[PDB]
Design a protein around this ligand. Structure first.
Ligand SMILES: Cc1ncc(COP(=O)(O)O)c(CN)c1O
Ligand SMILES: Cc1ncc(COP(=O)(O)O)c(CN)c1O
Ligand SMILES: Cc1ncc(COP(=O)(O)O)c(CN)c1O
Ligand SMILES: Cc1ncc(COP(=O)(O)O)c(CN)c1O
Lengths: 439, 438, 438, 438
């Protein structure tokens, strides 16, 4: 009869159904962790859900504003004046300390992230790319070792493997989630394989249970690229190391670059900490114990900013799931008419990006006409597959690669604008263009 | 009439004139951003203020009672005027939402390019990252050798190691703590691709001579200038110059940052590409190079950098005053053959102030200074590159003998020197050094 | 497309658009100093922000619990942003040592001249001084008469009396609290030299009609616009306009200041001379007029004024939103013939918000509002000019009868209205006014 | 032992001590705000510091090279220490929103009343306004006569004229530039109401004798002391003393301010009412006087004044050292009958330093000092009161002949003298004045 909102995706889907009266027979409390701060302030009173919240008016301030155009991700809309005020307030305390490399806000953010993820050890880093590189080194990756990964992620995933001399081995995706197909991983394992690197793409989690099953047979490490999936329930249950990004355009970000390494493995965590600061023994500067390292810890200043901005995470993820649901329901007719395929609602998705598939070769037409005739920006995350860049490396090593389902899906994929400070009037403008263009 | 450019050579001229050690000379100050504070504090109607007193106006001497000295208290490296200006520019940057690339990044690159008189600047997320990217841009492959000294901060060797290349250590000179040009040629092999001199402690290496050797062997030069911002004529002979803007440098941001500086467009484009995932310039998600890093500066830190660089020439001027004051007031201890002091030169920006304690007395002096006199001194850096207990050292560097580097390492000691220290604090260090060497 | 100029008419058009009462209108904002805050808060990339919520973003509504209301708590008239900017400009002005006349004075004169579209501006030490000097500039001699209303702040009549001139009071109209043009002509004598209309509470008088009479009788018009800054087309028909920048005006400095504004160069030169000891312009110590005052603005206050005027159009917008909200939410009380409310007009800048409590109930409503409901209201101003207990009134004004002024004075009540008020505070006032009139 | 009170007499005594003209006395210093800088700079534990070198510790003589001399460069009249303290106090004033009256005004009136040993102080918006209000408070009516010198700043005569009263000019004496008390009596008519002596250049008039005449004729005395703050026993014989805190006075704020000082409670109450609209004190909008002005000090300027007055006794001491230095080092030129110098007296606070160049040479000397030596000198004031190019002078003062005033006017020249000048700058003046007279 009572759910305590933990700030993750499972409870956010349940809360939404309550708010929309799709259940209205359950009661909610909310936990006091920092990622719930804005949600608790906005939607709760004395740790009970406020009475008659109007999602459209109270959460999105729907007021029949007239819309002329839609940008896909206008960065000036992704931070709120309330966040800015809190950032200025905390920087007024950080700046006079002079502590701008390591510092107490870094440690606090590591503690918040560890609690939120239920992991023991957190190393906050200067980016998700750096987190991934360090984590590969900590598991003992050496030049020439093979890392199995999909070919449809952001370039950072493959780049971190290549930066340390290791070899991406691309495996195709499934037909349902844009995630690595686990039934194709075993075939790609070689004497040289050291690691499986699944990507929780667009905010949706891979089938980690089956991936872990294969990794245990072959004694392989799993490092999870969760850079788009913060807030997703049970993230990391099966991986050795989980990688986060706090890039400013992620569901949670700082005001600059940052990320994190998350693990329960103390051996790996200690090596990650050493490699992230020059190979030095922890808190013994200038004394190397590893052969080398990077300069890749988070900035204390960005950690302070992160501790302000993470207060909005639960609430902004709730707004994302509302918006994704609204797309799915309102484009359903285009799915019925076999013009598009839409994503489905699931408990794990945090909706960092909203993918649809435009069928029958029409994707480019729809994208171009959405822009030119309706002033609606859509985007393709990402426009070139890993084995298709026009680079010397591709011409040397991956000209043989054939990834059937990844390549076909790549001709169909289109992402719709979805970010938590968009107006519902802005989403309606996208909806009526997509319906209008499909006739 | 001379125009103060904000670099070390003009700062030395200005100091001599402020201290009454010059002829009737006049000064104007260039209206570049690194001179902003010096112009406000020392100039009036584009001329030197007639009424400047260094001790009371620049250092705010007030016979303050001092009980102890810390080497580098980080809260003293940032002033309240800096904080107010930083808050002001953060209120402009934050509502733009531009937190990766952005216009403050481009503006800092322009400001740095003008200050260094170089055509291309890539602002990076750290000096370490700038060095790693620059090594890749000149074509360094795993296995290639890079000639460098063994007495730098670990970042210098780490950037070489992170990309799979091989440090080859060469001994330092007999004066300036810098790589000995006379030892470089004997270390060149067919794998050598780069000479990586370090302008250690703020002092420049003898780059004209290093360039002579580099041209004979068709080698690149990448200069680690992470400690030397403001040094006059920096980079004249290097292919690429690396800067660090970490917070404890002579100029820093409020976090990590650095820069790659070069006149070579081909290298500059590759640096831009490698610093952002290998993508073509302004073509996110489209790689042209095989891979890259996520190593551009944060727009927010660039905005902070444009506010804090206002203080660079002024803080560098305070540093040279402090350095000169140590040299002049410790002269008796060098006359007595107990220490060796640095000399004043026009290129040094005095990021760190080294002395040498000879006759094996360095440890006793450092320890008594702290235990008896409550003075922190430090050794930058405590372990030489070929002497860490790492597998790499144990497998590769156990036969390296760097006789001057190792001997100087037994004698070096750094004295507190930072631009917001009080002259009362420096007097406290001076009295301890005199007293411990009776 | 409309360009927001920062005056009252455009503010009303913007307010209608922001409240959704408009048909697809687009706005630009003029890049003038009085629009600075509005541009940063409401505009982005040269257009209105698409995501503006008046209650949340402009008034920061948050269901704050309110327990009392003060009419004008002075600490709420200045924001922390204004303070940081003021400290910033004080750090520039103070080391110049320019504390009488100076360049910020001249710049404020230019900004005000631009904003009022008038050729000449003399910034003064107060609105009272501006009015005194302006009266002298038009040639007022002791004994000359000045026609004016009797319901203004005491400063208006005091400026006339200080130079030995004679106020001649005329009744107000039945709809605006302003001097009735239809009563002016009867008051003109051979001694009349000036008509002095007051734009009371921020509302403009009917100046076209007053100019018609002034031209027939070739009389000067000096407009007391000390409460009306920002009102569209202010001064169109006046010889000289007087402004006040006292801290509790719609735009104020941090001390006393005001201005004289005119297109007439002869008057402007005499104003300049009278405001600084009668000296010829820029000839200190050399008088050309018989005497003068020490009545220019302080350069330091002009610098503060240039920072605070950044908020003028935005704070005037918040005022007209508050005024509109009172009118709408008190409409039932006027329907019930308990009160009379002001109307929205394009000229009003809503310095003060007057209502009339009729049927003799004004005192009971005011007193119950405070003692029963903890709501401060006020009467600007409590004593009419011809009713003070002074020797001058007893000797000169005992036969004055101003029927409308006196009747309105028994019914007027001003409600709290200032731009940093919360909507929760305005709701508290509203509920109190509703409950006391059940 | 002498306790330094911060006035004229003790400064001269202390100067004679510091110079070894008498090193046989002990000094303490009182804790009043005007002594704050002197106590911090010259005392430890309320005893005079042992090490005091006037030239080095107080004037920072550094053998600086000087190219030119401006008479009163306003950017030298305020020190960075003052600026820092002003910014500090303004960060406390500004968030209060109290910018008209306020608690700093009251505190400054208390500090001034203790320093002057007077019971009542009304801090005003200028010394001119203070004088006008005080003339009205003693009952001056249009046509009443006020006896005054003709060589003061125009403000003295202007305050009389602005209220319709009539200046009656009296000649100055042959020793001090002050009103000759032996010429006052013959100017008294049945219209005389006030004698208005001017303590010109910081020197006190012979007030004992002027009061003897004023009692015989039942006249008020209002003393223009706008240049004489810190003068020992100031105001002993006057009904009201007028001060200016104009920023170029021996003590000033950062804007216009002044004060009315009196022991007469009836006069003080009327001054208070006249300085704020005629209202009863602490009851705005209720007039008790027929009119009034808007002439109280700004609370913000009072706050600045409480910071800047900390330097008053110390800056007055530097002035008297500088004056004594001119006197001793120009004695040559007086001995040769080229100039007349002032004499040291215990009452002079040395706001301006007058010499007389005789045998018609003044204008030649002033022009050559500027054209040939780049030394600015000035004549305070260039036009006598009865000589301005005005309609009033042509109507009323064409018969006035003031023999001594007019002859001295042909001779007077003021030498640069301000407390932050360098001794090197005064030497430059001394050498030019010697050389031009060779
Ligand atoms: C799936 C994925 N992986 C890795 C990264 C790299 O993260 P960062 O930008 O923090 O280096 C990104 C982009 N933030 C990403 O989207
Ligand atoms: C000589 C030297 N080189 C390289 C670096 C690396 O700079 P950064 O800290 O900006 O990575 C530093 C400072 N750590 C340095 O002092
Ligand atoms: C209508 C009116 N006229 C004149 C003034 C005088 O202005 P100041 O306070 O700037 O002297 C005021 C404000 N006191 C006023 O409100
Ligand atoms: C002798 C004298 N009297 C009166 C005044 C007028 O003082 P204020 O400038 O404060 O109005 C001055 C000049 N400040 C003056 O020098």
């Amino acid at each position: 009869t009572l759910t305590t909102i933990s700030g993750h995706s499972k409870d956010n889907l349940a809360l939404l159904k309550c708010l929309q009266g799709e259940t209205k027979e359950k009661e909610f409390e909310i936990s006091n962790v920092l990622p719930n701060h804005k949600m608790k302030e906005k939607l709760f009173r004395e740790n009970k859900l406020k009475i008659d919240i109007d999602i459209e008016k109270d959460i999105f301030n729907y007021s029949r504003k007239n819309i002329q155009k839609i940008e896909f991700m206008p960065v000036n809309r992704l931070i709120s004046q309330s966040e800015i005020d809190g950032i200025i307030g905390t920087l007024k305390e950080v700046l006079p300390t002079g502590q701008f490399t390591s510092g107490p806000f870094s440690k606090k953010l590591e503690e918040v992230i560890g609690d939120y993820l239920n992991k023991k050890y957190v190393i906050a880093t200067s980016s998700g790319t750096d987190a991934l590189m360090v984590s590969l080194l900590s598991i003992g990756i050496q030049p020439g070792d093979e890392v199995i990964m999909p070919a449809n992620s952001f370039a950072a995933t493959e780049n971190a493997v290549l930066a340390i001399g290791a070899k991406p081995v691309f495996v195709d995706i499934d037909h349902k989630s844009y995630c690595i197909d686990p039934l194709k991983i075993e075939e790609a394992i070689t004497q040289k394989t050291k690691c499986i690197l699944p990507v929780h793409l667009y905010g949706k989690q891979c089938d980690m249970k089956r991936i872990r099953e294969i990794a245990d047979v072959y004694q392989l490490r799993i490092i999870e690229d969760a850079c788009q999936a913060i807030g997703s329930s049970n993230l990391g249950e099966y991986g050795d190391i989980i990688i986060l990004s706090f890039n400013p355009y992620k569901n949670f970000g700082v005001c600059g670059k940052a990320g994190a390494i998350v693990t329960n493995n103390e051996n790996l965590a200690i090596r990650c900490n050493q490699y992230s600061y020059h190979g030095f023994e922890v808190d013994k500067k200038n004394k190397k114990v590893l052969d080398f390292g990077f300069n890749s810890k988070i900035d204390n200043l960005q950690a302070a900013i992160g501790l302000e901005r993470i207060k909005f995470l639960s609430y902004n993820n709730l707004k994302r799931v509302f918006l994704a649901q609204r797309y799915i329901r309102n484009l359903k007719e285009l799915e019925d008419r076999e013009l598009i395929k839409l994503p489905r609602m699931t408990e794990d998705n945090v909706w960092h990006l909203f993918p649809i598939r435009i069928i029958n070769g029409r994707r480019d037409e729809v994208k171009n006409k959405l822009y030119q005739l309706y002033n609606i920006e859509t985007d393709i995350y990402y426009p070139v597959l890993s084995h298709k860049h026009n680079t010397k490396l591709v011409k040397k090593n991956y000209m043989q690669d054939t990834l059937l389902n990844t390549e076909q899906v790549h001709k169909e994929i289109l992402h719709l604008p979805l970010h938590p400070n968009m107006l519902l009037e802005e989403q309606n403008f996208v909806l009526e263009g997509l319906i209008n263009v499909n006739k």
